[PDB]
């Protein structure tokens, strides 16, 4: 079986700039019949793949003119001029010239944009949860860039280690920012041993850290 190699594995690009993704085959993709069956797909975060380019350089119906494919033989390129926020996702080449059809490994197109500060929110555990025997306190960082952020938990002013989990969304299709949840999970017993719950956020968009907190039962 032939190998499809895509480069780079990840491509950061600023809005309005050109992105170029390379696909290289170990064997020529030109069929004895004269045609080259090399196609491109984009899979955006969470979605089915979408057909982008067929036979090297032809845009599928509805694909913007900013997408173009070129190349021949073993070397192929997808170029996206004037990159837009909605172009985010993983691009895959795909050959069906030789048995059996194969995809390349994908190139994740990432958007570079200006730093943006998180808006920060904290949520106490619900009474419904408490009556079940656990307490989760949730800290939300909304719509920030870059992805690097430090979230620290303080309980009655003691820094907490090891009882929290973070989850980050993919870059947003419209404004290219991230959001992040940090969840502190305690037993109801331990939760009820303390009064003040706070999450402190450090981020390059913030000139000093932002703390959100609440006193329980309040």
């Amino acid at each position: 079986e032939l190998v499809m190699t895509q480069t780079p594995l990840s491509l950061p690009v600023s809005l309005g700039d050109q992105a170029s993704i390379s696909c290289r085959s170990s064997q020529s993709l030109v069929h004895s019949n004269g045609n080259t069956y090399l196609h491109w797909y984009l899979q955006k975060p969470g979605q089915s793949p979408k057909f982008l380019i067929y036979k090297v350089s032809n845009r599928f119906s509805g694909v913007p003119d900013r997408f173009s494919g070129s190349g021949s033989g073993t070397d192929f390129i997808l170029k996206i001029s004037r990159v837009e926020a909605e172009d985010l996702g993983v691009y895959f080449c795909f050959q069906s010239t030789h048995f059996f059809p194969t995809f390349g490994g994908g190139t994740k197109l990432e958007i570079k944009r200006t730093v943006a500060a998180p808006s920060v929110f904290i949520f106490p555990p619900s009474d419904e949860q408490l009556k079940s025997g656990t307490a989760s306190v949730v800290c939300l960082l909304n719509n920030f860039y870059p992805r690097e952020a430090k979230v620290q938990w303080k309980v009655d002013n003691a820094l907490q280690s090891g009882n929290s989990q973070e989850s980050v969304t993919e870059q947003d299709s419209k404004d290219s920012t991230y959001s992040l949840s940090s969840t502190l999970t305690l037993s109801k017993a331990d939760y009820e041993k303390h009064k003040v719950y706070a999450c402190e956020v450090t981020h390059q968009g913030l000139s000093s850290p932002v703390t959100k907190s609440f006193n329980r039962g309040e």
Binding site: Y37, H39, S48, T102, G106, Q129, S132, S167, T169
Partner: protein, 219 residues
């Protein structure tokens, strides 16, 4: 319009058989191929094979010869993928995709079906409100959400107000805890003015355990 609608997520034990369906509509079913593509979690797409509904003939890639089969119900314009003797490597999302043979390409794809192979029994989530961050009388933006806690396997669906609330919603990737169960939150930001005049409900669906919850999130 061309549409391919796949069956819902499945949890199966090792050694079992699963059959996934793909209901096609909006075109002459027999005149296009049906391709099947695997995507293991966080991994690249892998072409498995295709069946030709016009001749009934199947063709597999080398990795998918043996325990994989393609079936058709032409009267129901439905394609099937069956996997026998399930293994952990089989845990993935599987896509059907119509093959437009005039250019040897897959044009329209299904939404994917998640299959989890596991010895563990399904566990449905508990859904808890994340109460609005501010009152109706203050200014600007409030966040609210739902914590979807302790379930297995992936996926759960979360929508807001039965799909009518779409703007400003972030549903975080699931994360495992040391219990071996997943949790996630879904959050939405809304004008705090609208907190006293608009109801917000999160609709959570965990198909493997047959859990459907609607949680009213009030301040």
């Amino acid at each position: 319009q061309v549409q391919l609608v796949q069956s819902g997520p499945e949890l199966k034990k090792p050694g079992e058989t699963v059959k996934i369906s793909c209901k096609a509509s909006g075109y002459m079913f027999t005149n296009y191929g049906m391709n099947w593509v695997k995507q293991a979690p966080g991994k690249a797409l892998k072409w498995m094979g295709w069946i030709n509904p016009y001749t009934g003939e199947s063709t597999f890639a080398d990795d998918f010869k043996g325990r994989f089969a393609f079936f058709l119900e032409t009267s129901a314009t439905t394609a099937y993928l069956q996997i026998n003797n399930l293994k952990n490597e089989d845990t993935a999302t599987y896509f059907c995709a119509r093959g437009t043979t005039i250019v040897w390409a897959m044009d329209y794809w299904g939404q994917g079906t998640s299959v989890t192979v596991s010895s563990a029994s399904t566990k449905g989530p508990s859904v808890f409100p994340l109460a609005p961050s501010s009152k109706s009388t203050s200014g600007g933006t409030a966040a609210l959400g739902c914590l979807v806690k302790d379930y297995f396997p992936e996926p759960v669906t979360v929508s807001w107000n039965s799909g009518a609330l779409t703007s400003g919603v972030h549903t975080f990737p699931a994360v495992l805890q040391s219990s071996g169960l997943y949790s996630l939150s879904s959050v939405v930001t809304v004008p705090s003015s609208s907190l006293g005049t608009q109801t917000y409900i999160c609709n959570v669906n965990h198909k493997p355990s047959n859990t459907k919850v609607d949680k009213k999130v009030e301040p």
